[PDB]
């Protein structure tokens, strides 16, 4: 077939390369053993076709399908001799590693062939000098210490500076989101959804008929209300001012509706951020008034934000939280981009959209009795149980708080390593949520600090270490 395409790529039969290019054949094309044509071309320093391929639009940053002679021989189930003569004659005869070549970009092989020209060609085509192969080796790793290495490392510094400027203006362009991300542990997707919705309304791409309306689905004690207040303080800049919370359970009867119709709280601020808790179990009339608020635009307020919460669909969301995290982090990845493509994949119906219209809305609808009611919401937000790292970070937040307080009041330095956190994480019970952590730290640590300070065993200016001795587990405080 087009084996001759990369035999040409391997021998630099340029007139044939153009030919097949004209027939629309893809440059990314690989061998039966897995190397891209650009790889063979780069390895044998056949620049005319390297140049042409980087012209055609061949991807430089494509990893090799080939691993080792032994390995590929075991995978594709062949004699080691077949595989060997193949890799040797159809690719290169200078490579010595019995290690795996899986994930080597053309830049890798370029450094391995020790030629500056194809390195330069690959770099000019925006190849990654930091792309790691399965081992973790950059092409710089495999570079002889030439000025080739200087070229490649300066490339590294360039790509680095690019990353850094990119960070700087993800900060400049999405400040609310930076604020949420730096004041809230975990819950990536939630922040993304909420912030994006907010500036979606600010820029004017919602029907500015009625203020923002959110529904926070998920579990107790994982950031819902916290996120809400955070948003509030970002908008009104007064921590106190912009925020309203209604405990819905209080309302379950028709007399509660007379009370509900808040009117004064709204009067203090039209523009504030309002939250309802466990909204699923509250009077339908209360919601209809709530929906009337959510449609009307008296009900004076306009530029307000409306948030609702439920433990409803909690179990369902929980049952599978992986594809939600994946999707969330994918969105963050696609956000720091700047071309019409990236936006076009913003067109796509993301798995979350399928997730609302398959499993969630039916349950949401049945509990709610109104098609209209699911219609009224600007956005539905999901909240996830913390992964390990996030729990660690919560504990960390706690210890940092107490260390800080100690250092100002009594000038005491509180210290610890990772094990302490790893142990206190084992004190996280779900039913209370992040506070659970609050408890543990205040129990296993602050009790001890208070006890010691009472007894005058903490002298002003001392230094302490939180340690774990297994003798079953006990946490011990010591003075250094
Ligand atoms: N991601 C989080 N980041 C930081 N603090 C959190 C986080 N999640 C919960 N907390 C802490 O928990 C406290 C409030 O709990 P919170 O998560 O806001 O309640 P909730 O999830 O909305 N459910 P509920 O208990 O009904 O209000 C805050 O003071 C936080 O310090």
Per DSSP, the residues of 395-424 read HHHHHHHHHHHHHHHT--EEEE-HHHHHHH
8-state DSSP, 387: P
Distance from residue 221's CA to the centre of ligand 1 (Å):
4
Report which ligand 1 atom has the smallest distance to the Cα of 221. Answer: 21
- d(CA 217, CA 372) in angstroms, rounded, equals 18
For ligand 1, atom 26, name the residue with the nearest CA: 220
8-state DSSP, 46: -
Among 344, 365, 345, 361, which residue's Cα sits nearest to residue 353? 361
Among 8, 145, 6, 122, which residue's Cα sits nearest to residue 65? 6
The torsion region of residue 447 among left (phi > 0), alpha (psi -120 to 50) and beta comes to alpha
Distance from residue 432's CA to the centre of ligand 1 (Å):
9
- d(CA 203, CA 206) in angstroms, rounded, equals 9
Q: Which residues contact 175 (CB under 8 A, 6 or more apart)?
A: 234
Check if the beta carbon of residue 54 is closer than 8 Å to that of residue 60: yes
Q: What are phi and psi of 412, to 5 degrees?
A: -115, 130
Report which ligand 1 atom has the smallest distance to the Cα of 277. Answer: 26
Among 355, 475, 349, 477, which residue's Cα sits nearest to residue 424? 475
For domain 174-382, is the CATH number 3.40.50.2300? no
The torsion region of residue 45 among left (phi > 0), alpha (psi -120 to 50) and beta comes to left
The CATH 1.10.8.60 portion of the chain extends over 388-479
Q: Which residues contact 181 (CB under 8 A, 6 or more apart)?
A: 191
Match domain 388-479 to its CATH number in 1.10.10.10, 3.40.1390.10, 1.10.8.60, 3.40.1380.10. 1.10.8.60
Give the number of other CB atoms < 10 A from CB of residue 292. Answer: 10
- d(CA 440, CA 427) in angstroms, rounded, equals 6
Q: What are phi and psi of 475, to 5 degrees?
A: -105, 125
Distance from residue 206's CA to the centre of ligand 1 (Å):
29
8-state DSSP, 36: B
Percent composition of the chain: helix, strand, coil (DSSP 3-state, to 5): 55, 10, 35
If one residue of 180, 182, 382, 433 were mutated to test the ligand 1 pocket, choosing by the most ligand atoms within 8 A of its CB, it would be: 433
Sheet of 305-310: strands edge to edge?
243-247, 273-277, 305-310, 212-217, 379-382
Bridge partners of residue 274, in order along the sequence: 244, 306
Residue 328 CA: distances (Å) to CA of 190, 201, 335, 387: 8, 21, 11, 14
Check if the beta carbon of residue 68 is closer than 8 Å to that of residue 83: no
Distance from residue 347's CA to the centre of ligand 1 (Å):
33
Distance from residue 184's CA to the centre of ligand 1 (Å):
9
For ligand 1, atom 28, name the residue with the nearest CA: 226
Resolution of the deposited coordinates, in angstroms?
Answer: 2.9
Distance from residue 330's CA to the centre of ligand 1 (Å):
25
User: Reduced to 3 states, what is the DSSP secondary structure of residue 380?
Assistant: strand
User: Reduced to 3 states, what is the DSSP secondary structure of residue 172?
Assistant: helix
For domain 3-167, is the CATH number 1.25.40.20? yes
8-state DSSP, 475: E
Check if the beta carbon of residue 295 is closer than 8 Å to that of residue 210: yes
Q: What are phi and psi of 467, to 5 degrees?
A: -130, 160
- d(CA 132, CA 141) in angstroms, rounded, equals 9
User: Reduced to 3 states, what is the DSSP secondary structure of residue 119?
Assistant: helix
8-state DSSP, 443: I
Report which ligand 1 atom has the smallest distance to the Cα of 224. Answer: 22
If one residue of 180, 184, 194, 223 were mutated to test the ligand 1 pocket, choosing by the most ligand atoms within 8 A of its CB, it would be: 223
User: Reduced to 3 states, what is the DSSP secondary structure of residue 52?
Assistant: helix
The CATH 3.40.50.300 portion of the chain extends over 174-382
The CATH 1.25.40.20 portion of the chain extends over 3-167
Helix (H) or strand (E) holding 37: helix 37-43
In the chain, the N- to C-terminal Cα span, in Å, equals 73
Check if the beta carbon of residue 257 is closer than 8 Å to that of residue 225: no
Enumerate residues lining ligand 1, CB below 6 A. Answer: 184-187, 220-226, 277, 433-435
Q: Give DSSP secondary structure letters for 267-280.
A: HH-SS-EEEEESTT
Q: Give DSSP secondary structure letters for 174-216.
A: -HHHHHHHHHS-S-HHHHHHHHHHHHHHHHT-S-TTS-EEEEE
- d(CA 312, CA 362) in angstroms, rounded, equals 12
Among 223, 213, 377, 367, which residue's Cα sits nearest to residue 281? 367
Check if the beta carbon of residue 147 is closer than 8 Å to that of residue 119: no
Burial profile 214-240: b = 16 or more Cβ within 10 angstroms, e = fewer: bbbbbbbbbbbbbbbbbbbbbbbeeee
Q: Please, which experimental method was used?
A: X-ray
Bridge partners of residue 276, in order along the sequence: 246, 308
Report which ligand 1 atom has the smallest distance to the Cα of 184. Answer: 3
Q: Which residues contact 168 (CB under 8 A, 6 or more apart)?
A: none
């Amino acid at each position: 077939k087009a084996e001759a395409f990369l035999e040409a790529a391997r021998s630099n039969d340029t007139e044939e390369i153009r030919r097949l290019l004209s027939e629309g054949l893809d440059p990314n094309t690989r061998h039966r053993l897995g190397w891209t044509a650009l790889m063979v071309a780069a390895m044998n320093t056949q620049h005319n076709v390297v140049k042409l391929l980087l012209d055609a639009g061949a991807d430089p940053n494509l990893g090799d399908g080939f691993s080792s002679v032994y390995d590929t021989a075991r995978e594709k189930s062949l004699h080691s001799l077949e595989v060997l003569v193949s890799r040797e004659d159809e690719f290169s005869s200078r490579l010595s590693s019995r290690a795996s070549f899986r994930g080597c970009s053309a830049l890798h092989y370029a450094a391995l062939a020790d030629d500056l020209q194809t390195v330069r060609l690959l770099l000019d085509a925006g190849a990654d000098p930091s792309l790691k192969n399965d081992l973790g080796h950059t092409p710089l790793s495999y570079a002889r210490d030439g000025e080739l290495s200087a070229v490649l490392r300066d490339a590294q510094d360039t790509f680095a500076e690019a990353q850094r400027k990119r960070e700087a203006e993800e900060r400049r362009k999405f400040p609310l989101e930076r604020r949420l991300k730096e004041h809230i542990i975990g819950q990536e997707g939630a922040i993304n959804t909420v912030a994006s919705a907010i500036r979606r309304k600010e820029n004017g791409w919602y029907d500015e008929e009625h203020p923002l309306v959110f529904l926070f689905l998920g579990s107790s004690g994982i950031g819902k209300t916290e996120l809400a207040k955070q948003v509030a303080r970002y908008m009104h800049k007064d921590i106190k001012k912009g925020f309203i919370r209604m405990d819905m359970s209080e309302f379950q009867e028709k007399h509660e509706v007379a009370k509900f119709i808040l009117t004064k709280q709204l009067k203090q601020s039209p523009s504030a951020v309002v939250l309802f808790d466990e909204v699923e179990k509250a009077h339908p009339d209360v919601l209809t008034v709530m929906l009337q608020l959510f449609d009307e635009g008296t009900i004076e307020c306009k530029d307000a934000i409306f948030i609702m919460t439920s433990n409803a669909a909690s179990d369902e969301i929980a049952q599978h939280a992986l594809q939600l995290r994946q999707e969330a982090q994918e969105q963050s990845r696609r956000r720091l981009a700047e071309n019409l493509d990236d936006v076009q994949k913003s067109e796509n119906i993301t798995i979350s959209n399928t997730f609302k219209e398959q499993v969630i809305r039916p349950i949401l609808k049945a509990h709610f009795r109104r098609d209209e009611f699911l219609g009224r919401i600007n956005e539905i937000v999901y909240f996830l149980p913390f992964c390990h790292s996030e729990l660690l970070q919560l504990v960390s937040r706690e210890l940092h708080y107490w260390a800080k307080k100690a250092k100002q009041r009594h000038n005491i330095t509180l210290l610890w390593e990772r094990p302490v956190l790893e142990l206190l994480v084992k004190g996280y019970n779900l039913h209370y949520g992040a506070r659970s952590i609050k408890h543990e730290v205040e129990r296993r640590v602050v009790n001890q600090l208070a006890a010691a300070f009472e007894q005058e065993l903490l002298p002003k200016g001392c230094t302490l270490r939180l340690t774990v001795d297994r003798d079953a587990p006990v946490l011990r405080l010591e003075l250094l």
